[PDB]
Nucleic acid binder design. Sequence first.
DNA 1: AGCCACATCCCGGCACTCGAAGTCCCCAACTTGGATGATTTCTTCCAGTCCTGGTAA
Length: 195
Amino acid sequence: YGCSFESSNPLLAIGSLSARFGALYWYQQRYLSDHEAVRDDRALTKAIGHFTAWPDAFWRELQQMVDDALVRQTKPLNHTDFVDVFGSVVADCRQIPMRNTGQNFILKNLIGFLTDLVARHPQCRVANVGDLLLSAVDAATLLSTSVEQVRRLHHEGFLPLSIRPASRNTVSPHRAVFHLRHVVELRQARMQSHH
DNA sequence: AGCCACATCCCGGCACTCGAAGTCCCCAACTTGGATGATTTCTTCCAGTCCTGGTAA
C-alpha cells in the first residue's frame, strides 16, 4: 500500500511500488512452482527472508548450473547456444518493467556475475565458457536497449557476426549469433550512463 | 421497458523460426560467281472343289 522503509539492507527493501510488485512476481514463478493452493498469504510470506542474503546467494545458484551443464557437454562450446547452459534466466529479467540498471536490481546482479565469469576465462587454443552464442534479442536485454538499435550497431561495425548465413535469406532475432565475451566488453566500453 | 439464447471475443497457453560461405559483368556473327551431256527399262504357263429356299403343281 506504501513503502515507508528505513535501514533497508535487503535488495527487496527499497524503491517505488511497481518494482516491489515485480520482484514478487519473479520470485513466485521461479520458486513457488507448486500448483496454486490459494496459500495467498503463506506462499508469498517467505519471499522477504529469501532475499536477505541475495547479494551472496544468487551467484551460487548461477554457478551451480555452469558445472552441471558442463559435464553434460556434447559439442565444442563455441557452437553451443547460450540458452543451453543458463535456461533463459536472461529473459526473466524482463518481468520487472523498468529498463535501466540502477532500478532493476535483478538485472544488475546478473550482469555483475557475467562480467566476472568472462574475466576469469581469457581466450586460448581450446574453446571455453564465454564463447557461447547470444541471439539478437539477448544482446538487446544485456545492453539495455531495443533490438533495432543492435541492428544499427552491427551495421556500423562495432561488433562481429560469427555464423555465416545462406544467401537470399535473413537472420531472425531468435537465431544465436554473437559471442558472449564480445558483448560484455562492448558494454563496458561504450554503453555506460549515469543510471 | 424487462428477460432470455446465442453469437463471438480476448487472455493464458502452446508450438514453431533454425544450423552453417559466396561461382562475372558487356558489345559484334561475311560479301561475288557458277549444279553436265547420250544411250537403253524382259520373255514362258497356270487362277480349285461342296454343304447352307419358299411355294404350289
